[PDB]
Design a protein around this nucleic acid. Structure first.
Ligand SMILES: [Zn+2]
Ligand SMILES: [Zn+2]
Lengths: 198, 198
DNA sequence: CGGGCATGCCC
DNA sequence: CGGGCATGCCC
């Protein structure tokens, strides 16, 4: 069986989808999202809010999992990891080899798959508070996309899966990520490239 | 006492000096030397011939030591090391944390100073073969100057000391090193910069 | 802050 | 091979 996890969108019977906050114009904004590219541009080790939207209420015990995969076919089979440098100078529960962290959640779990060796981070699904339409999770990416010996400039996808306590896949979505020093610059560059030569 | 080793030229009573081979014009020549800058430009993990010249014969048991130091005052006190990435994917006698290796010598010693924590690599001094005016040692630099988490774009000096078996300093010389992908390009850039704004 | 250097890599 | 993109950093 494949050790490459699915990246195929599956909004499912609960109508699961992701949302992202709008950002300012700054060259080095901390986080910004491109709907045209389905791609988040963000700085390393800084908050990256991702909203979870559903049309129907998931059952009690539903979990929210995040996992990085390399986008390009030629790299899909390689596990996405922290580079050796940031792993060694790493700063609570997260193993230093994990790229993706969740902040501000008391029930975060970090998993190293016994068979596929892939990393993921899981929190309980909470329904939106009354008067809210979505649930926000604060992700952190602990390397730049360019990190030598880690992502090494290879674009990644973040796969968000909604899973019941039994392990059934309820929903899956994904978005591309570039972790970089200047998210505003690089977003504009890539959207201009899309228009000019895409 | 200082943990910063001397970089002061001391040609000494044996008239000790370094020599360097001339190189071609290629953008990515493997090794090239600038007399104006006293600076070697070379590729990582590739041979970097350094000639030892003396006017008088050193005594039996003389040793040749090489050691890297950061050139800029603000970094002199930090030990020059291999970056975490190249340390982890490191390929005989050299500890993977050492930047500088010697190839082709059966009597190489690698030393980690017990008190200053500085790395060095030592070989016996051999007199030039008859019909030769110098002795060539093949050094290898195992990171680029730009390596994240190692030299991190900070220029280094290589200090070559001639030492008798008793530990007396007989001679000291040094040269600046930039380990980079394109030594020919970067040499020309830096010599042009010297002329234009030095 | 935004203009522009930096430098291994471009597949 | 040499022209030029790349992208964290410029002190
Ligand atoms: Zn990293
Ligand atoms: Zn390195």
């Amino acid at each position: 069986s494949s050790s490459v996890p699915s990246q195929k969108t599956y909004q499912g019977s609960y109508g699961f989808r992701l949302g992202f906050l709008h950002s300012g114009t700054a060259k080095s904004v901390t986080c910004t999202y491109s709907p045209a590219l389905n791609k988040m541009f963000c700085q390393l080790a800084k908050t990256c809010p991702v909203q979870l939207w559903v049309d129907s209420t998931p059952p009690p015990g539903t979990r929210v999992r995040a996992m990085a995969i390399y986008k390009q076919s030629q790299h899909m089979t390689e596990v996405v990891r922290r580079c050796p440098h940031h792993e060694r100078c790493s700063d609570g529960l997260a193993p230093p080899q994990h790229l993706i962290r969740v902040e501000g959640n008391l029930r975060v779990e970090y998993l190293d798959d016994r068979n596929t060796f892939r990393h993921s981070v899981v929190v309980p699904y909470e329904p939106p508070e009354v008067g809210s339409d979505c649930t926000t999770i604060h992700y952190n990416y602990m390397c730049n996309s360019s990190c030598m010996g880690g992502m090494n400039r290879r674009p990644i996808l973040t796969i968000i899966t909604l899973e019941d306590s039994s392990g059934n896949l309820l929903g899956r979505n994904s978005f591309e990520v570039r972790v970089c020093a200047c998210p505003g610059r690089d977003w504009r560059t890539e959207e201009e490239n899309l228009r000019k030569k895409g």
